[PDB]
């Protein structure tokens, strides 16, 4: 799918060695038109038992259960989307659901309740955009963690990388061919990758883009499915 | 085990 494009885009920028030029003009590479629509604002790793719960920046919630199924609660607080292993989607609500989804919906509720009361919203300083709140939300396609980061791949092709130690974050989009970098002060800049090639960037962002490439490679080498 |  789009991961192949993302890998192209990252290799291209990394190959240009953006931090090794005479004058870095990183600001020239910012493009506000590329600001992402969605990113993960909160997450809870309960995967030893149930799965990975997350909140998107639009206050919608989702769970990727250990059996590779998914529940998405829209930000209206009732509308539900269930995704089976093969990707089959069905629509329903918390108030009206098959009894068969009782347990999973209860789990969703607990995740929702927890991320409603606890934790800071990543990207809180970026504008809530007026849009169709029921327009199809992306869901968490897959995820994994390393010692250094959690890697989140969304069904809209975006890859998010949150670094544990310094709390910096990347939001990569292969459609916009852009990266959003959230730094240690929670400053939020969105860059077109091709312009990072043109103008370069600081060594800190350059290092993270190198890591990002490695992570996308992992996603590609383990995409599996049936 | 969870975000910030």
């Amino acid at each position: 799918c789009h991961l192949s494009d993302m890998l192209q885009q990252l290799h291209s920028v990394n190959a240009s060695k953006p931090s090794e030029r005479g004058l870095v003009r990183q600001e020239e590479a910012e493009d506000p038109a590329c600001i992402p629509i969605f990113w993960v604002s909160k997450w809870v790793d309960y995967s030893d038992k149930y799965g990975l719960g997350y909140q998107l920046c639009d206050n919608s919630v989702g769970v990727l259960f250990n059996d590779s199924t998914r529940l998405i609660l829209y930000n209206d607080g009732d509308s539900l989307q269930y995704i089976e292993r093969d990707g089959t989607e069905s629509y329903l609500t918390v108030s009206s659901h098959p009894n068969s989804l009782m347990k999973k919906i209860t789990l969703l509720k607990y995740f929702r309740n927890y991320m409603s009361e606890h934790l800071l919203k990543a990207g809180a300083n970026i504008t809530p955009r007026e849009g169709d709140e029921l327009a199809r939300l992306p869901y968490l396609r897959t995820w994994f963690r390393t010692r250094s980061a959690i890697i989140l791949h969304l069904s809209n092709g975006s890859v998010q990388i949150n670094f544990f130690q310094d709390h910096t974050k990347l939001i990569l989009c292969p459609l916009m061919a852009a990266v959003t970098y959230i730094d240690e002060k929670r400053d939020f800049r969105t860059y077109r990758l091709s312009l990072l090639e043109e103008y370069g960037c600081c060594k800190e962002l350059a290092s993270r883009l190198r890591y990002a490439r490695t992570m996308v490679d992992k996603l590609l080498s383990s995409r599996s499915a049936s | 085990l969870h975000s910030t």
Side-chain angles (χ1 to χ4, degrees), chain A residues 42-43 45 120, chain B residues 1 3-4:
Chain A
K42 309 185 181 188
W43 58 265
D45 181 355
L120 299 173
Chain B
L1 286 308
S3 57
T4 306

